[PDB]
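Exercise 7. Predict the joint structure of the components listed below.
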Amino acid sequence: PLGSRKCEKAGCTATCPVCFASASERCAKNGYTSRWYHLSCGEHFCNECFDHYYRSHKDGYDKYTTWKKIWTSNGKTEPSPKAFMADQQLPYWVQCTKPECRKWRQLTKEIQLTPQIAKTYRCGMKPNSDHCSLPEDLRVLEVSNHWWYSMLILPPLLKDSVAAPLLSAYYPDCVGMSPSCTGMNRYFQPFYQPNECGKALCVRPDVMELDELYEFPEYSRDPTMYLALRNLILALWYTNCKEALTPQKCIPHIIVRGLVRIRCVQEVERILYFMTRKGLINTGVLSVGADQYLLPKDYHNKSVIIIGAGPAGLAAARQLHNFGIKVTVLEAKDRIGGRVWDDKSFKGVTVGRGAQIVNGCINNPVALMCEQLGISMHKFGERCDLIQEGGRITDPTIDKRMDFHFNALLDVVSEWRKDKTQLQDVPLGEKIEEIYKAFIKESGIQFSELEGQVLQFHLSNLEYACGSNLHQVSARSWDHNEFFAQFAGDHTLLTPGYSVIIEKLAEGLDIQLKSPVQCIDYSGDEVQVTTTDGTGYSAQKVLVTVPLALLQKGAIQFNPPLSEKKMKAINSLGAGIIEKIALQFPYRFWDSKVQGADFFGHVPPSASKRGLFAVFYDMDPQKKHSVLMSVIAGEAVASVRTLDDKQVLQQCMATLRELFKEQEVPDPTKYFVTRWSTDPWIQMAYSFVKTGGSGEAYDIIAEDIQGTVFFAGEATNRHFPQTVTGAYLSGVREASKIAA
Amino acid sequence: DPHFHHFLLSQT
Ligand SMILES: Cc1cc2c(cc1C)N1C(=O)C[C@H](c3ccccc3)[C@]13C(=O)NC(=O)N[C@@H]3N2C[C@H](O)[C@H](O)[C@H](O)COP(=O)(O)OP(=O)(O)OC[C@H]1O[C@@H](n2cnc3c(N)ncnc32)[C@H](O)[C@@H]1O
Ligand SMILES: [Zn+2]
Ligand SMILES: [Zn+2]
Ligand SMILES: [Zn+2]
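Solution:
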């Protein structure tokens, strides 16, 4: 009775402490010791094994002292002996993989657990019978106790985390990894680097997000363990995005000593299901059979009707279906896609009638889906000569000077805006002109006719981006979204076209074409949905993803009706528009002058001609086929409404022959002219903020009604308005709301 | 600062 059989730790449940270390030849083993040291309720080490490492005279001091330097040389947390024991000496635990057994087992203290060992382990396995029948150590079931983790002194620290290589710039212990530790698509950069400017869909390796905190409050005090698991999961997903990430797949990559490993394994499942629901992993164009739904059966019971089969509806439909939720999509047109619609009949090339460009591929779901599909994008070159009528290529210094001046007018507007309210908003177009004449009259500087036309060109570039003449767009709010982190990296041409992704998202889903929804009634126990021919559908929840213009036209009857607040938000945004023309030629007539540039600009002769074929795109990055695509923006959209396709073509060809005046231009052998503005179920290209409006409108439209009626679409995404990406993400957003 | 915050983990 010289020594103790009781644990130092007050409240500890261990009635019979035994020493896991047996490092000292004088180890107390399971008998009496001066003091029992507590790592967990199930794990202790005696005073002499403590001293074996902690005392300068003992034979373990060497090792401990070295570890302590490293722990300090690429680590930040305190290197006590308890920390050393949890990181270096604590025996590993591994779960038997026999389906009928599944018992946890302690490995002998010299065996170093690896993924391979964890993957295939079953009771009794040693490098050099009836092992599964032996009872499971009692301390294992203990780990499930609510207080077990509170009785655990130091948080776990993962070893050889898949996330480690992507996290070199951090101290491993701040991201749940062990300091004592020693080709991914370039577009996958899920982790912020230390002190780096904001970018879209990026997370801090060392801080829990709002939603994470909300779902896992028990970690607000200490996130170490959560962060490590979440980081490991993200790294695994992006390491192989072509298959579903499962707990079985994650478990072998969780390497840490002691019973706590059991806690980590049991936690990785909850975290993984949270990441899946929010759409962080197991997403994109990944598809899974009935046998393999991504969420447990408890999310499964409920039904959804999704209205619209564009990127937004299809994203949500894909997500929900993958979750195991019963989904039905109703599409008005005779095709899926919405504002994604590819013409695949041009020999050797795919020409988008709608979207075909990706602005910022880093962390972009579109770039992820390309990886999953094994398709390539073409990054745009920089050069874009501004060609005049007829023939002269504008001096680049004139291009850069007027660009500089145009952005200048924008800066001053961003100053004038700082003290105005929505009630005081003025059209961007008006305020620009005004600032221009002001500046002109101040410093008498005058611009050449060509300078004024090049400015006309740059102005047209903003009208294109807004989908409207600037006299309808808000000076206060035109660029509201820039407030949020935007997608970094390459701007590309989706050569194969967005349709490839649309089709994958749609494959195997219950989709009803030519079924235009007319009535939505959510006043009863289930949502009653009625099409224009009187066909009835019903489900517990309904997701609306129709274009902004269709909400403004009130094409769908809501009962109860949308709120006045919602109607104001809906009416405060503009239904922006542009159209495209695509021309096929017998040969690449522009090669001599264009010299391999992806696109070239067309200087407007006069303000009146602004936006009329402002830019031409060479639609084959391989420089082999001959297809040009051009855009009609701003006022020019109007002037084309009353013309038939043949007439639009005439003016394009005439424009081209002016642009290439000093040479012959062959006749086109195939073309299309888009009519988005008069497509009855679309009537637009993309949204923008009208004068008097706020970026807040996007949130307000996005707001669900009574957790019964939900909304998605490009016009509901405040961070990323307008884009296929933003539309897709809004659909993922709603799928997460709905699945909860 | 929501000039950093992940769009998908900021919905509450
Ligand atoms: C039309 C068009 C679009 C673009 C482009 C050109 C053109 C001509 N792009 C460009 O050239 C560059 C360009 C760009 C981006 C930002 C700002 C300015 C330009 C874009 C591009 O290339 N890249 C891109 O991201 N999208 C752009 N892009 C915009 C995107 O295509 C759209 O934002 C995206 O497709 C929106 O998806 P969402 O899912 O929100 O709507 P969509 O309209 O596709 O589908 C809704 C569906 O509801 C259906 N529907 C409507 N009413 C009903 C009803 N009552 N019942 C049932 N179904 C209905 C309707 O038929 C339709 O299928
Ligand atoms: Zn001991
Ligand atoms: Zn204890
Ligand atoms: Zn077993």
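Discussion. Chain A touches chain B through 25 residues (CB under 8 Å).
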